[PDB]
Every structure is written in structure tokens, then in C-alpha cells.
């Protein structure tokens, strides 16, 4: 807290959807103590062995003969660190990995797979510390979430349908900050996915609701978008002090 | 930040500037100097630009488009095709080749835009380099009319012939390593 | 819009991206205040 540098304290863009922008302590700890967003989840950790076995089965020749070769072998498959080889086809590997994430065979919902098309690296991180959030999946310009899923969830009790079934169906997906860097998001389905003057026609995900970017204390603020930003921080601090 | 941009020059203000003044720091964050022009140069923009050029530090790197080192066995050989003409001209009445010539050639090529912006002259640059380094570096300069501004630098003629050194016949820093050191020194320390 | 301009007024209500960018600006202001206090206090003690 003693350090007066105003770099580590500022609200970074990558905090979107994973740390509350409004809720921070004021004083020596501005921007140094943060609070999770409402929908944020933190990875618990998993063994990387099944992912490595799948990669070995698909291709990912390790101990190759200087095959990168100006990255002719597109992408270098990384895991939690540990360059484990490279593949000639990166897009097929990425699509197969996403399908496996849906079928929940080798990839748990938390396993994060990032391909950097330029620089040609795939990172595949499962390291127990990543903070991720659920996002709906957009195929073409259509959300995968449909009336069947919503009707089943509406009957949630005595229908034995829950959020985990929504994840298993492949409707929703957990995305961490690294994957948030490689994903085109839409705030709302109707306003953005629908055909208009085409800003983007390659949306890959959709926010479940924007208001989830706020934390627990900032979520009680009514009409927070109509207030000045410091006032929402003040209300977070004061709502921690209310009597009830 | 939020300082009004009267001119394109940043200035420390507020608490940090008060700290600098109060501490009498030897290194200000933004040391600046306001210069007022005495004569008609204040009124006329071209003379003011001349003063600005005279007051602004310019290294050879700022005006150099690209530098290369070619091993040229003979001056007449002209390994680079382009220099074959002007080298010939300079070697129609060769000067300082009586001792010897260096087998290595530093063919610096200057950007015309930077040269004309700083209003530098090929004779000016050649004089600065040759005089500051001495007779050791011999420089051949192109005509400004030529499409490429080329400066051909060679190591000491007497040092190449080794009659002047006498002592022991042992290469010091070879010649190409010495030429690379010379190139770095010219790039960052010419102060044209 | 991409780089932070907020066209909506407070009465109209900020859109989500405008909301996040406004939060970034307010955070910068708060950090400035908190950092300012200590440096100014040290200067004042030295002068006195």
C-alpha cells in the first residue's frame, strides 16, 4: 500500500466481468483490494494428463526435427507451461478441443484453451487460479440458447434441469481473461447479433446480462448507470456499513 | 495530464514540479529552455528555422538511411555497381591512395529527406567526419544530384600499408571489427 | 465509442461499455486523490 505508483491500482480493461469496477476500498488500498463479480468463478484446478493424452492422440509430435520452421507447423501446443510439441493443423485442433469441452470427456468446463493466430501458439491452461465467467455461445449469428432450454430451466424444480445441464448441452461456456482476449462478445443478442449495419458478423459469444459485471455491494445500487462513478464506490463502502 | 497544449512541449506542473523546485533536484524531469531571437530572425520564419537547426542536436544516425560494410579488394574493382562511376571520378586524380587504400569499405547511405530537413550538406558531413576522425578515415561523397546520397569511408591508408606504424606487424582489432566500432561511434557520437 | 467516449448523459444512463470506461476514469481520480495526500503532506512538513 505504501507505493504511490498509480499503475497497479487503475481499473484494467481485463477486469471486465470478473472484478467489480465500483467496489474498491478507498485510502491506501484504492484499486489494490478488489471484489469478484457476481457471475465470476475461480478455477479449482485439474490434472493436465488427459489433455496431454488427447493431444498426443490427435497429433502434436514432440521431439521433432526443427519442424517449427518459421512456424510452418502452425501453432505450438502449450499446457500449463510446458511446450508439449506442435501441430500442423491448428484450427481443426481448436475445434476438436471445443467439441470435447462440450462432451466433457477430457476437458472440464474450467479448462482454458487459447490460440494466438498470430505468433502461432495454443496455451491450454488448467492451473487452479484462473478467474473465468460464463458466457453464452453464438454460432453463426444465432445464440445456441433456445426456447427448449429456457422452458426446461423455468420448470427447474421437479424437472431435474439445472445450470450444469445447460453447460453440458454446450449452450454456455466458461471463459477466462486469456480467452476473453480471443473472443468476440455481444452485450445483448437482439441488439447485436441481429442483422443491421454490420459492425461484426463473427460474434462467438454473448453476455448473459451486462449487470453481472458488478459485485455484491454494487449490485444493490439502483440505476447505477445514472450515477457518477466515484459515487458507486462510495455506496459500496457505505453498504458494507449499513445496519440490518 | 490535462495540461492545455499551448505548444507541443510537455512541462512538469503541480506537485511533482513543486518537488523538483523545492528539492533543487539536479535532474529535472523535463528540463526545458525558452530561447528568444534577437534580430530579424524572430520576425522571419526561415531564419528562425535556421536558428532551430543550429540549436538542435543532430547525430549521423538521424540522417543515415542505411549502413553497410563491403569488402572491396580494389578501389577500381567497385564491388557495388553504383559507385563505379563516382569512385572512378575520385580516382581519376586519386588523393591519399599513395600510402595505400583500405580493403574494407563502409558504404553509408543517407536519407535525402532528413538531410534537406536539417539542411545538412554532403561536404559538411564529410568534413566533420574526416576532420574529427583525422586522416585515418577517408570519405568519398556523392553529388547531391545523384539519386543516392552515398558516403564511402575507408580506414587509414598508412595504417593499411603499415609503413607508418612500423613496430610489430600485428593486426589490432582486425579491420572489420574496427570498422564496426567506427560505425557505432559515428552513429551515436558524430554530433554533426 | 470504442475508445471511451460516452455520448449518453447521466439522466439518459450509460451503456455497459460506457459504464466500464466511466468507472476507469473515476478510479483514476480516486487514485490521484489517495496518492496526493502523502506527497503533499511530506512537502508541507519539509517547508515548515
Amino acid at each position: 500500500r505504501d507505493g504511490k505508483l498509480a499503475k497497479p491500482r487503475q481499473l484494467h480493461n481485463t477486469l471486465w466481468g470478473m472484478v467489480c469496477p465500483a467496489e474498491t476500498p478507498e485510502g491506501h488500498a484504492v484499486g489494490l483490494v478488489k471484489n469478484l463479480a457476481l457471475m465470476a468463478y475461480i478455477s479449482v484446478g485439474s490434472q493436465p494428463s488427459p489433455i496431454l493424452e488427447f493431444l498426443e492422440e490427435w497429433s502434436m509430435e514432440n521431439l521433432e526435427e526443427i519442424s517449427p520452421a518459421a512456424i510452418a507447423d502452425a501453432t505450438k501446443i502449450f499446457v500449463n507451461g510446458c511446450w508439449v510439441g506442435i501441430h500442423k493443423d491448428p484450427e481443426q485442433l481448436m475445434n476438436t478441443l471445443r467439441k470435447l469441452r462440450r462432451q466433457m470427456d477430457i476437458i472440464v468446463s474450467e479448462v482454458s484453451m487459447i490460440r494466438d493466430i498470430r505468433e502461432r501458439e495454443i496455451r491450454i491452461y488448467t492451473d487452479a487460479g484462473r478467474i473465468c465467467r460464463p458466457l453464452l455461445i453464438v454460432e453463426k449469428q444465432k445464440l445456441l440458447l433456445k426456447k427448449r432450454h429456457i422452458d426446461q430451466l423455468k420448470e427447474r424444480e421437479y424437472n431435474n434441469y439445472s445450470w450444469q445441464d445447460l453447460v453440458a448441452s454446450g449452450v454456455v461456456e466458461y471463459i477466462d481473461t486469456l480467452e476473453e482476449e480471443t473472443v468476440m462478445l455481444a452485450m445483448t443478442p437482439d441488439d447485436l447479433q441481429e442483422k443491421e449495419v454490420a459492425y461484426c458478423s463473427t460474434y462467438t459469444h454473448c453476455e448473459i446480462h451486462p449487470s453481472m459485471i458488478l459485485g455484491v455491494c454494487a449490485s444493490i445500487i439502483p440505476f447505477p448507470d445514472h450515477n457518477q462513478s466515484p459515487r458507486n464506490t462510495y455506496q459500496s463502502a457505505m453498504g458494507k456499513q449499513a445496519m440490518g | 495530464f490535462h495540461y492545455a497544449g499551448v505548444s507541443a512541449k510537455n512541462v512538469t506542473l503541480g506537485v511533482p514540479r513543486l518537488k523538483e523546485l523545492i528539492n533543487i533536484s539536479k535532474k529535472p524531469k523535463t528540463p526545458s529552455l525558452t530561447v528568444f531571437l534577437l534580430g530579424q530572425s524572430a520576425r522571419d520564419a526561415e531564419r528562425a528555422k535556421d536558428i532551430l537547426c543550429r540549436l538542435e542536436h543532430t547525430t549521423l544516425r538521424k540522417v543515415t538511411a542505411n549502413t553497410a560494410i563491403y569488402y572491396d579488394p580494389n578501389p577500381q574493382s567497385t564491388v557495388v555497381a553504383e559507385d563505379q562511376e563516382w569512385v572512378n571520378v575520385y580516382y581519376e586524380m586519386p588523393d591519399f591512395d599513395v600510402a595505400r587504400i583500405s580493403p574494407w569499405l563502409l558504404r553509408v547511405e543517407l536519407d535525402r529527406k532528413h538531410m534537406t530537413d536539417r539542411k545538412l550538406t554532403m561536404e559538411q558531413i564529410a568534413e566533420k567526419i574526416n576532420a574529427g576522425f583525422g586522416d585515418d578515415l577517408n570519405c568519398i561523397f556523392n553529388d547531391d544530384n545523384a539519386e543516392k546520397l552515398v558516403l564511402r569511408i575507408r580506414i587509414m591508408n598508412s595504417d593499411e600499408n603499415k609503413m607508418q606504424e612500423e613496430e610489430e606487424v600485428v593486426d589490432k582489432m582486425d579491420d572489420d571489427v574496427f570498422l564496426r566500432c567506427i560505425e557505432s561511434n559515428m552513429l551515436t557520437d558524430m554530433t554533426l | 465509442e470504442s475508445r471511451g467516449f460516452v455520448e449518453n448523459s447521466y439522466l439518459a444512463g450509460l451503456t455497459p461499455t460506457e459504464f466500464f470506461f466511466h468507472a476507469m476514469g473515476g478510479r483514476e481520480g480516486l487514485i490521484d486523490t489517495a496518492v496526493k495526500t502523502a506527497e503533499t503532506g511530506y512537502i508541507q512538513r519539509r517547508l515548515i
Partner: peptide, 8 residues
């Protein structure tokens, strides 16, 4: 939060 010349 206003502009570049104002405040954040």
C-alpha cells in the same frame, strides 16, 4: 471523466 483537458 469529461475530457482531455478537463478531469478524468
Amino acid at each position: 471523466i469529461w475530457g482531455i483537458g478537463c478531469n478524468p
